[PDB]
Amino acid sequence: SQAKISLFYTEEHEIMKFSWRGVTADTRALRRFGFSLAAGRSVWTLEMDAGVLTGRLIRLNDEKWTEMKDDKIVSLIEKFTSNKYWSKVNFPHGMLDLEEIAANSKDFPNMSETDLCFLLHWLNPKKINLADRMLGLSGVQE
Amino acid sequence: KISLFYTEEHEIMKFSWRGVTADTRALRRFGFSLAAGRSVWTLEMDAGVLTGRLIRLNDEKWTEMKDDKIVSLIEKFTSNKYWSKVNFPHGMLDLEEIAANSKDFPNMSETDLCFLLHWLNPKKINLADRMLGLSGVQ
Amino acid sequence: KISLFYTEEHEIMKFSWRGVTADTRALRRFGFSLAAGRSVWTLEMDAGVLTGRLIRLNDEKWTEMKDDKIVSLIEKFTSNKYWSKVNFPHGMLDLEEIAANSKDFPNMSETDLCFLLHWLNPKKINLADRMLGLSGVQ
Amino acid sequence: SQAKISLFYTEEHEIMKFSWRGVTADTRALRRFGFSLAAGRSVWTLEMDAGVLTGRLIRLNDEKWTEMKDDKIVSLIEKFTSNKYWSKVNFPHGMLDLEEIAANSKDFPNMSETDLCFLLHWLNPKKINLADRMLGLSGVQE
Amino acid sequence: KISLFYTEEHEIMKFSWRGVTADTRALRRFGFSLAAGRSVWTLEMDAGVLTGRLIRLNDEKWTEMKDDKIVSLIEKFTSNKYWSKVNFPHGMLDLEEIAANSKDFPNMSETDLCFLLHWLNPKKINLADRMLGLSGVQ
Amino acid sequence: SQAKISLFYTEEHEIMKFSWRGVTADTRALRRFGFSLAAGRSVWTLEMDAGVLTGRLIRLNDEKWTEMKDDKIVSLIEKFTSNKYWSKVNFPHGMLDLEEIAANSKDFPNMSETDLCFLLHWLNPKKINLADRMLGLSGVQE
Amino acid sequence: KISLFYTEEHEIMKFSWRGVTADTRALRRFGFSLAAGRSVWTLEMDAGVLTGRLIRLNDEKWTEMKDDKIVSLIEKFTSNKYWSKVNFPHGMLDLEEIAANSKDFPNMSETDLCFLLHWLNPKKINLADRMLGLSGVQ
Amino acid sequence: SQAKISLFYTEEHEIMKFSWRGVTADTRALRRFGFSLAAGRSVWTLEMDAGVLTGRLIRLNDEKWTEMKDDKIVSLIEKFTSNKYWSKVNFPHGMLDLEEIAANSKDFPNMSETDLCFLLHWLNPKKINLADRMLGLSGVQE
Amino acid sequence: SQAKISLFYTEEHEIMKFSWRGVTADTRALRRFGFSLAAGRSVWTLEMDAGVLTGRLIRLNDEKWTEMKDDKIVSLIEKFTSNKYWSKVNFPHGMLDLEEIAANSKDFPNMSETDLCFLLHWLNPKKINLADRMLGLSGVQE
Amino acid sequence: KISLFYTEEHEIMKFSWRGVTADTRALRRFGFSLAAGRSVWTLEMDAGVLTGRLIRLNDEKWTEMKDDKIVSLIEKFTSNKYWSKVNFPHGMLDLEEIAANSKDFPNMSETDLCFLLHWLNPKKINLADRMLGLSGVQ
């Protein structure tokens, strides 16, 4: 049978230190999303440089990734990665208009506009709300 | 009809360059809605203290909670004319005395008004206990 | 009458989503009670350092320990007026000098005050040695 | 003579990793309790789904269980399991009010209210206090 | 040719000895340049309110921003004689009515003038959200 | 060793608001002085009622106090507070003649006239010069 | 011998009951003493404008400042007979023209007289910048 | 190979407290700059006394320092510290004329005037603009 | 318990400008009085048009009001406002004879003549004596 | 019996339409009453100058003040026959010479008459200092 796509997340700058000072966190706390095409293979993620999205997709293994389940996303990654040169994708720098990117993209013809947009929204790094995270909530939303 | 709610808040946040420090203890506030969709009522706080008044506070994220005893007490409390116009002693430091001297809710016993005042009272949250998996609710 | 005690604490905890990281070394603190039921006295710490003062710290979980030599030294120490009002040099870095220059406990010898100051002093715990079955007491 | 009831515990998310980083643990560390009606037979435990008690009792053998002794609990399990359809029990979802559950239960007439409550308190999963467990204590309490 | 800009400002600062206190909410103002190097135009404010007039405000630090829809609307707006001489109702409280009753920009539709008036309108900034990493732009 | 005396100041009506109006201040801006006998203990200050000195000494903790250093004043507070009933002192209402108060006082025999007068001058509330404070100067003098 | 000084002043204060409002900008004035103890000389102001004359103004609180270039220029300026009797054009609006047309200080070059006139000239102070820790000296 | 110079910054009086009062900051907020000659070794910085630069260089480890990268500055520190008695430097008190200090200095002959001046400008403490820092900007400039 | 009445004052044309000219004031300087039935609610005051009292009561929030204490006035406002249509009151234009207004009024039966007159005297705008105000006195009297 | 008093006055007021301008400095005058209820005596002023005579001035608002030294001096002064009939040199410019040459109060020393004349002397008030919270009494 065909190889299973695995979903993952990683967090950066998310440590909250408890000392006599109280609870210190870093305002750059962020959650990143990635995928593996096969078990053991490299985790793919949207590339970031200087804290901004470059528009490219890279392998980022040096990070600690945690498995997550989303049957809808696995279906969308299956379609996305069945296109030749998906890894070579170069979306507009900054990736500010996700709806326009999906609407004007001609690189994934096996994917609908609503579906590429849904996937681009999942791959998008999400800021951690520190006031919620101190209250033990994920604090993750767009 | 009657629905119970809570909201949580950091009363102080201290900023550093690219960093934030909060107190080991945050605050949990309690509120109620008389009907579905209608405004959440809560004990008013100004300058970090209880004013003694009751206000609508919708701009906050409230989460539903269940307490059959409290709903029975809110039913009695809100069946009095001018309950919203209540003005308890500033600071609300002696909850037992407030309930004992109150003549505004004659359909409520002293032990019952006191029980409700104790539920409406903001409570501190220990964030370290919270982050370890517990509710530092105090 | 006089009872000895210890308490243990992580001075730093680092939180991750659904995870916690502590230092390889935690801290053990020492205290005493003058009578059964009465408050546990301990060397005060503020901002992670020894202030030089002695305080009551009951909010902590204390475990009884036996040391006949220490009880004899606490007996001498506490039979002085204003022992609770003691204010040793901030940080309490030179325990030998503190004992040598102290004129507040004339019923105590220099070697004896120093021995007691060494017992009251917080001590680091190695958690890896602790979890292997030993007391990483240092 | 009659077959002996065996008591057991299992821990989940309780591993503490020692590295250069210090000591890392998982804040979901938990202890679960179970029983076997006969030697070799399946270990019974209160079912959990999405981290919450369903109110049902299930066999959970895929876990590593460690024997423990409690003569009072064995006496209570003896009474509990001598009722027909004990395995078919469906307590209120979440099992938040253990005192009320025992008070209103009409399924175990050979058990007193104080006794069913005592057993329900033993079967209840108990969180591991990580600050105590790092100090080599069980850290187990309600 | 046409360039968009923003500037941010604390409308109130409260001074204490060696300390300053600002409002949780600051203000963001919007402006435009007709040509590179030329003066930045913005809605005039006097006594903390919108006067209804448009002025040059160069003494402020302005940062470029991109909005292709707004540049198209400024192009239409500024191709009218005496656009700089515009005097909207004092306070500019009803932006929808201002656009509906305006007869000064016949090359602009009501929905378009209203869209532009909404962009030129000063907007409050939540500093707590700002310092946490977000733009409290409201 | 003996407990350390801490010195403090508090300011009332001292806020200067910067708006479009310019700089507004309150002409009642004033600096008050206090002392703590031990760390954590209550701050003592000369009592004021209706803007006038009553002649009494009170605890005033509800105010925000800032630590200050003055080795001469700590020496004088040490002498002052080593007298029984120092807290019970009741100087002439208004405390208009500080030199006469010190000269006629028989309550602090361990203190010289010049020394009690020096301390009374330090404890005395001092008006804030608003023209200097707008120029970023303390504006504090008698 | 020669000493430099400055003084600061609010030209307008607006009183309200129990309150005062000053302008965002105050004024800094500059002066010089020919000998230690002797009177501080400064450009005279009347009705808020520069009269063009030089006067002694001792009733003000002056603070010493160092400027080796200015002391050299004051030395040249004051070594002329009747320097105190100088009467520059009222208002002193064109400092460059004043220096260019002056025939009273032949030991001083035009660029040097102009440099000195620029130093003696009262300068506005931004109080908001001042209270933030800077000198709003302009 | 030769040991790597590390660059650092520290901030003093820079905390902004968010309460019901709004945002309070301290008008003495300041950023200081320092360097380490080797990993683990002490951070060197321009000494300040009574809020004014003394003209001397000191070790200041009791402070929390954050690493920063500047390849030009590392090159200048390399030249600066390859002179004997660089730590013993005593620049004019207050250090008011940085251009004159660099022009008249005969202590660093391996450094050009423009280069010593560039380094002196980097070592110089910089005030934090509180209006910018409340708008989430570094607010750091001369 | 019942909601607390708050007392307030506002001043118009009361600014005294200090310049080289001396002290300039406006001869229309006046003090107005108002009340709030509840905390946060609108401040009520006697309406003025063309500098003369109309005889009506209005809400005037656009003004800066300062709290004042008067236990006798709060008691009188309590009685006054416990009448239906108190806000709809229309006293004789100009309100020149306050004693006659109170004597002939049949709108406040829970109030005595001496008491309504006392309240009408408090609500009455009072001119500021500029010669006293320049001498730092309130200058307020009828 | 003897009571001390002061009164304050603007010697000049300049009127504009709907406006008034007073001098930065007003005047404080001093007076005394020999008995409770009786008329307040003060140094007479005519054409803004001191005439050298003493008059009753009741039409003014006087405020009581305490000065035990002055009451002792008024006691001596008023125990002389014809003290009210005193006619000091017009203008009263040299207070030290007036006291030195006076032969009308033989029960008073020169230093004492001079001290009293200095107290009775009208004193200027700085209104700007006054409005800032101080007494500009000079």
mmCIF file of N, CA, C and O in Angstrom, chain J residues 70-114:
data_model
loop_
_atom_site.group_PDB
_atom_site.id
_atom_site.type_symbol
_atom_site.label_atom_id
_atom_site.label_comp_id
_atom_site.label_asym_id
_atom_site.label_seq_id
_atom_site.Cartn_x
_atom_site.Cartn_y
_atom_site.Cartn_z
ATOM 1 N N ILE J 70 5.030 91.179 68.609
ATOM 2 C CA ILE J 70 4.339 92.372 68.131
ATOM 3 C C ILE J 70 3.310 92.881 69.142
ATOM 4 O O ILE J 70 3.259 94.092 69.361
ATOM 5 N N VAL J 71 2.538 91.975 69.791
ATOM 6 C CA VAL J 71 1.533 92.358 70.791
ATOM 7 C C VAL J 71 2.210 93.095 71.961
ATOM 8 O O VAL J 71 1.689 94.111 72.428
ATOM 9 N N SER J 72 3.403 92.622 72.369
ATOM 10 C CA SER J 72 4.213 93.240 73.423
ATOM 11 C C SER J 72 4.652 94.659 73.006
ATOM 12 O O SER J 72 4.645 95.572 73.836
ATOM 13 N N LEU J 73 5.011 94.839 71.719
ATOM 14 C CA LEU J 73 5.437 96.130 71.183
ATOM 15 C C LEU J 73 4.281 97.107 71.013
ATOM 16 O O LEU J 73 4.450 98.281 71.347
ATOM 17 N N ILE J 74 3.093 96.623 70.573
ATOM 18 C CA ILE J 74 1.865 97.435 70.442
ATOM 19 C C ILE J 74 1.427 97.916 71.852
ATOM 20 O O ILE J 74 1.015 99.068 72.001
ATOM 21 N N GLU J 75 1.539 97.029 72.880
ATOM 22 C CA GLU J 75 1.219 97.337 74.282
ATOM 23 C C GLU J 75 2.020 98.561 74.724
ATOM 24 O O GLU J 75 1.418 99.524 75.199
ATOM 25 N N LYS J 76 3.361 98.553 74.504
ATOM 26 C CA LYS J 76 4.259 99.671 74.827
ATOM 27 C C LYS J 76 3.889 100.926 74.015
ATOM 28 O O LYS J 76 3.700 101.986 74.600
ATOM 29 N N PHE J 77 3.745 100.787 72.683
ATOM 30 C CA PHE J 77 3.401 101.856 71.741
ATOM 31 C C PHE J 77 2.130 102.609 72.131
ATOM 32 O O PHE J 77 2.150 103.834 72.204
ATOM 33 N N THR J 78 1.040 101.872 72.386
ATOM 34 C CA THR J 78 -0.280 102.414 72.717
ATOM 35 C C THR J 78 -0.455 102.860 74.166
ATOM 36 O O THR J 78 -1.517 103.383 74.506
ATOM 37 N N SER J 79 0.565 102.668 75.023
ATOM 38 C CA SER J 79 0.489 103.134 76.413
ATOM 39 C C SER J 79 1.062 104.549 76.538
ATOM 40 O O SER J 79 1.223 105.060 77.643
ATOM 41 N N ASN J 80 1.339 105.185 75.382
ATOM 42 C CA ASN J 80 1.788 106.568 75.275
ATOM 43 C C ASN J 80 0.576 107.412 74.889
ATOM 44 O O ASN J 80 -0.236 106.986 74.065
ATOM 45 N N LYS J 81 0.452 108.608 75.481
ATOM 46 C CA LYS J 81 -0.627 109.530 75.141
ATOM 47 C C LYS J 81 -0.331 110.087 73.732
ATOM 48 O O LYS J 81 0.842 110.327 73.409
ATOM 49 N N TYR J 82 -1.379 110.260 72.897
ATOM 50 C CA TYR J 82 -1.293 110.803 71.534
ATOM 51 C C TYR J 82 -0.555 109.902 70.511
ATOM 52 O O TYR J 82 0.010 110.423 69.540
ATOM 53 N N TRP J 83 -0.588 108.556 70.700
ATOM 54 C CA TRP J 83 0.034 107.613 69.756
ATOM 55 C C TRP J 83 -0.697 107.629 68.417
ATOM 56 O O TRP J 83 -0.065 107.464 67.382
ATOM 57 N N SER J 84 -2.034 107.817 68.450
ATOM 58 C CA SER J 84 -2.932 107.880 67.292
ATOM 59 C C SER J 84 -2.677 109.147 66.469
ATOM 60 O O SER J 84 -2.865 109.147 65.240
ATOM 61 N N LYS J 85 -2.221 110.214 67.168
ATOM 62 C CA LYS J 85 -1.887 111.521 66.608
ATOM 63 C C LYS J 85 -0.477 111.568 65.969
ATOM 64 O O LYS J 85 -0.084 112.619 65.456
ATOM 65 N N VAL J 86 0.260 110.429 65.969
ATOM 66 C CA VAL J 86 1.602 110.323 65.377
ATOM 67 C C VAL J 86 1.608 110.710 63.894
ATOM 68 O O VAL J 86 0.675 110.376 63.153
ATOM 69 N N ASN J 87 2.638 111.466 63.499
ATOM 70 C CA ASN J 87 2.837 111.926 62.136
ATOM 71 C C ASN J 87 4.299 111.758 61.756
ATOM 72 O O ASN J 87 5.098 112.701 61.887
ATOM 73 N N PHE J 88 4.645 110.534 61.313
ATOM 74 C CA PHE J 88 5.985 110.159 60.856
ATOM 75 C C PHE J 88 6.316 110.888 59.532
ATOM 76 O O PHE J 88 5.391 111.365 58.851
ATOM 77 N N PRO J 89 7.612 110.990 59.138
ATOM 78 C CA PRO J 89 7.940 111.672 57.871
ATOM 79 C C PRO J 89 7.203 111.076 56.675
ATOM 80 O O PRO J 89 7.124 109.851 56.541
ATOM 81 N N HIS J 90 6.638 111.951 55.832
ATOM 82 C CA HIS J 90 5.892 111.559 54.641
ATOM 83 C C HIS J 90 6.673 110.544 53.781
ATOM 84 O O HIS J 90 7.882 110.690 53.586
ATOM 85 N N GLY J 91 5.982 109.503 53.329
ATOM 86 C CA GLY J 91 6.587 108.459 52.517
ATOM 87 C C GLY J 91 7.152 107.329 53.351
ATOM 88 O O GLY J 91 7.151 106.178 52.903
ATOM 89 N N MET J 92 7.657 107.654 54.568
ATOM 90 C CA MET J 92 8.258 106.714 55.523
ATOM 91 C C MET J 92 9.334 105.832 54.862
ATOM 92 O O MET J 92 9.313 104.606 54.995
ATOM 93 N N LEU J 93 10.262 106.479 54.129
ATOM 94 C CA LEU J 93 11.323 105.831 53.354
ATOM 95 C C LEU J 93 12.487 105.289 54.186
ATOM 96 O O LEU J 93 13.016 104.233 53.836
ATOM 97 N N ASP J 94 12.900 105.999 55.259
ATOM 98 C CA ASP J 94 13.993 105.533 56.121
ATOM 99 C C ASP J 94 13.481 105.143 57.511
ATOM 100 O O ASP J 94 13.546 105.942 58.451
ATOM 101 N N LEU J 95 13.001 103.893 57.635
ATOM 102 C CA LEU J 95 12.458 103.321 58.872
ATOM 103 C C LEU J 95 13.458 103.280 60.044
ATOM 104 O O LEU J 95 13.052 103.462 61.193
ATOM 105 N N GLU J 96 14.757 103.098 59.751
ATOM 106 C CA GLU J 96 15.826 103.057 60.751
ATOM 107 C C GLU J 96 16.095 104.425 61.365
ATOM 108 O O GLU J 96 16.323 104.516 62.575
ATOM 109 N N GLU J 97 16.049 105.484 60.529
ATOM 110 C CA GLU J 97 16.245 106.883 60.914
ATOM 111 C C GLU J 97 15.022 107.388 61.682
ATOM 112 O O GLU J 97 15.178 108.133 62.659
ATOM 113 N N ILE J 98 13.808 107.004 61.229
ATOM 114 C CA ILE J 98 12.551 107.390 61.878
ATOM 115 C C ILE J 98 12.585 106.955 63.351
ATOM 116 O O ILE J 98 12.354 107.790 64.235
ATOM 117 N N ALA J 99 12.924 105.655 63.595
ATOM 118 C CA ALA J 99 13.037 105.054 64.925
ATOM 119 C C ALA J 99 14.154 105.684 65.782
ATOM 120 O O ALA J 99 13.950 105.951 66.978
ATOM 121 N N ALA J 100 15.313 105.953 65.164
ATOM 122 C CA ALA J 100 16.462 106.593 65.807
ATOM 123 C C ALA J 100 16.178 108.032 66.279
ATOM 124 O O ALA J 100 16.625 108.409 67.361
ATOM 125 N N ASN J 101 15.448 108.829 65.475
ATOM 126 C CA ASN J 101 15.151 110.228 65.806
ATOM 127 C C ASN J 101 13.851 110.465 66.583
ATOM 128 O O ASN J 101 13.640 111.578 67.081
ATOM 129 N N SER J 102 12.990 109.431 66.696
ATOM 130 C CA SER J 102 11.706 109.532 67.401
ATOM 131 C C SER J 102 11.884 109.735 68.893
ATOM 132 O O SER J 102 12.627 108.990 69.520
ATOM 133 N N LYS J 103 11.204 110.753 69.447
ATOM 134 C CA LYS J 103 11.227 111.080 70.873
ATOM 135 C C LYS J 103 9.814 110.951 71.478
ATOM 136 O O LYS J 103 9.601 111.306 72.648
ATOM 137 N N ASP J 104 8.866 110.431 70.684
ATOM 138 C CA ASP J 104 7.457 110.281 71.052
ATOM 139 C C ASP J 104 7.131 109.020 71.858
ATOM 140 O O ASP J 104 6.102 108.978 72.525
ATOM 141 N N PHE J 105 7.983 107.984 71.780
ATOM 142 C CA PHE J 105 7.759 106.712 72.483
ATOM 143 C C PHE J 105 8.951 106.413 73.378
ATOM 144 O O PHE J 105 9.835 105.629 73.001
ATOM 145 N N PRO J 106 9.015 107.079 74.557
ATOM 146 C CA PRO J 106 10.178 106.884 75.436
ATOM 147 C C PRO J 106 10.196 105.546 76.157
ATOM 148 O O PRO J 106 11.229 105.188 76.703
ATOM 149 N N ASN J 107 9.073 104.811 76.154
ATOM 150 C CA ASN J 107 9.004 103.502 76.800
ATOM 151 C C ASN J 107 9.455 102.388 75.844
ATOM 152 O O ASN J 107 9.511 101.215 76.226
ATOM 153 N N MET J 108 9.810 102.777 74.615
ATOM 154 C CA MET J 108 10.248 101.887 73.556
ATOM 155 C C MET J 108 11.681 102.158 73.164
ATOM 156 O O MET J 108 12.057 103.314 72.962
ATOM 157 N N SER J 109 12.475 101.093 73.018
ATOM 158 C CA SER J 109 13.858 101.215 72.584
ATOM 159 C C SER J 109 13.901 101.477 71.072
ATOM 160 O O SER J 109 12.873 101.315 70.403
ATOM 161 N N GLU J 110 15.045 101.930 70.531
ATOM 162 C CA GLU J 110 15.171 102.201 69.089
ATOM 163 C C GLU J 110 14.983 100.918 68.289
ATOM 164 O O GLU J 110 14.202 100.928 67.342
ATOM 165 N N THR J 111 15.658 99.808 68.690
ATOM 166 C CA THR J 111 15.533 98.518 67.999
ATOM 167 C C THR J 111 14.096 97.974 67.979
ATOM 168 O O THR J 111 13.691 97.357 66.991
ATOM 169 N N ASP J 112 13.329 98.238 69.051
ATOM 170 C CA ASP J 112 11.945 97.813 69.224
ATOM 171 C C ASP J 112 10.967 98.636 68.404
ATOM 172 O O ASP J 112 10.079 98.048 67.782
ATOM 173 N N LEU J 113 11.128 99.981 68.377
ATOM 174 C CA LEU J 113 10.260 100.848 67.559
ATOM 175 C C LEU J 113 10.484 100.486 66.087
ATOM 176 O O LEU J 113 9.522 100.373 65.323
ATOM 177 N N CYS J 114 11.757 100.263 65.714
ATOM 178 C CA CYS J 114 12.128 99.900 64.360
ATOM 179 C C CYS J 114 11.530 98.552 63.928
ATOM 180 O O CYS J 114 11.031 98.421 62.807
#
